[PDB]
């Protein structure tokens, strides 16, 4: 009836940077929304707290949520290792879009990316499920620690996370 809101408190080499919050589009993509919500609260016994943004590419996107292998090869959903693409109603319209990373059709786990540009060519293959609500300036700050090949110049971590309200 109202979409939930979750936050991440970001750190750079252990030092506090700021907080980003996200509206999750539970109205349109409820299953995909609930996965990210629950990984953010940690209520299933695992999740995003302490994990890193392993791949950041300025002018493209910030990617993380690989909490098992910390490098883009791991993660798992609250539903099993993988779950299906729920739908593609929502599109990659611009900076701040929150979207699922994947390795093929119906291979969603826990990895996600926040867009820092319009990424139209991802439409219909990555499930869009939320957007940055507060702290797009902190996402832009994060982005400056990326590189063309995605390697970060300092360690970008989710020091804390959970649900607002
Ligand atoms: C713009 C979003 O791009 C993608 O989702 C494409 N694949 C990955 O990023 N994966 C592959 C992948 C993604 C999700 C899951 N669940 C498994 C594998 C993770 C990754 N990160 N850095 N590298 C080199 N690969």
GROMACS .gro file of N, CA and C in nm, residues 5 10-11 17 51 72 79 81 83 86 91 93 99 113 129-130 134 136 151 160-161:
model
   63
    5UNK      N    1   1.102   0.138   0.227
    5UNK     CA    2   1.222   0.218   0.216
    5UNK      C    3   1.335   0.152   0.291
   10UNK      N    4   2.722   0.393   0.400
   10UNK     CA    5   2.840   0.364   0.321
   10UNK      C    6   2.967   0.412   0.391
   11UNK      N    7   3.071   0.331   0.381
   11UNK     CA    8   3.209   0.365   0.425
   11UNK      C    9   3.316   0.348   0.318
   17UNK      N   10   3.102   0.766   0.513
   17UNK     CA   11   3.083   0.857   0.397
   17UNK      C   12   2.946   0.926   0.402
   51UNK      N   13   2.911  -0.602   0.336
   51UNK     CA   14   2.955  -0.638   0.203
   51UNK      C   15   3.008  -0.511   0.126
   72UNK      N   16   3.180  -1.045  -0.745
   72UNK     CA   17   3.093  -1.056  -0.860
   72UNK      C   18   3.064  -1.198  -0.901
   79UNK      N   19   1.542  -1.688  -0.165
   79UNK     CA   20   1.455  -1.791  -0.224
   79UNK      C   21   1.535  -1.909  -0.272
   81UNK      N   22   1.965  -2.016  -0.436
   81UNK     CA   23   2.080  -1.953  -0.501
   81UNK      C   24   2.039  -1.847  -0.604
   83UNK      N   25   1.679  -1.685  -0.864
   83UNK     CA   26   1.534  -1.679  -0.883
   83UNK      C   27   1.507  -1.608  -1.016
   86UNK      N   28   1.128  -1.140  -1.266
   86UNK     CA   29   0.990  -1.132  -1.221
   86UNK      C   30   0.907  -1.069  -1.330
   91UNK      N   31   1.177   0.049  -1.643
   91UNK     CA   32   1.287   0.066  -1.738
   91UNK      C   33   1.403   0.142  -1.674
   93UNK      N   34   1.576   0.439  -1.665
   93UNK     CA   35   1.546   0.572  -1.719
   93UNK      C   36   1.655   0.678  -1.696
   99UNK      N   37   1.861  -0.189  -0.985
   99UNK     CA   38   1.831  -0.294  -1.077
   99UNK      C   39   1.911  -0.418  -1.043
  113UNK      N   40   2.275  -0.322  -0.895
  113UNK     CA   41   2.353  -0.208  -0.937
  113UNK      C   42   2.268  -0.086  -0.929
  129UNK      N   43   1.379  -0.259  -0.989
  129UNK     CA   44   1.295  -0.275  -0.873
  129UNK      C   45   1.297  -0.165  -0.772
  130UNK      N   46   1.369  -0.055  -0.797
  130UNK     CA   47   1.366   0.055  -0.699
  130UNK      C   48   1.436   0.174  -0.752
  134UNK      N   49   1.702   0.913  -0.118
  134UNK     CA   50   1.793   1.014  -0.063
  134UNK      C   51   1.934   0.970  -0.077
  136UNK      N   52   2.161   1.055  -0.340
  136UNK     CA   53   2.225   1.043  -0.472
  136UNK      C   54   2.361   1.114  -0.473
  151UNK      N   55   3.746  -0.155  -1.103
  151UNK     CA   56   3.825  -0.168  -0.982
  151UNK      C   57   3.819  -0.039  -0.898
  160UNK      N   58   2.643  -0.044   0.739
  160UNK     CA   59   2.522  -0.083   0.802
  160UNK      C   60   2.409  -0.066   0.704
  161UNK      N   61   2.305  -0.143   0.726
  161UNK     CA   62   2.188  -0.133   0.644
  161UNK      C   63   2.063  -0.178   0.716
   0.00000   0.00000   0.00000
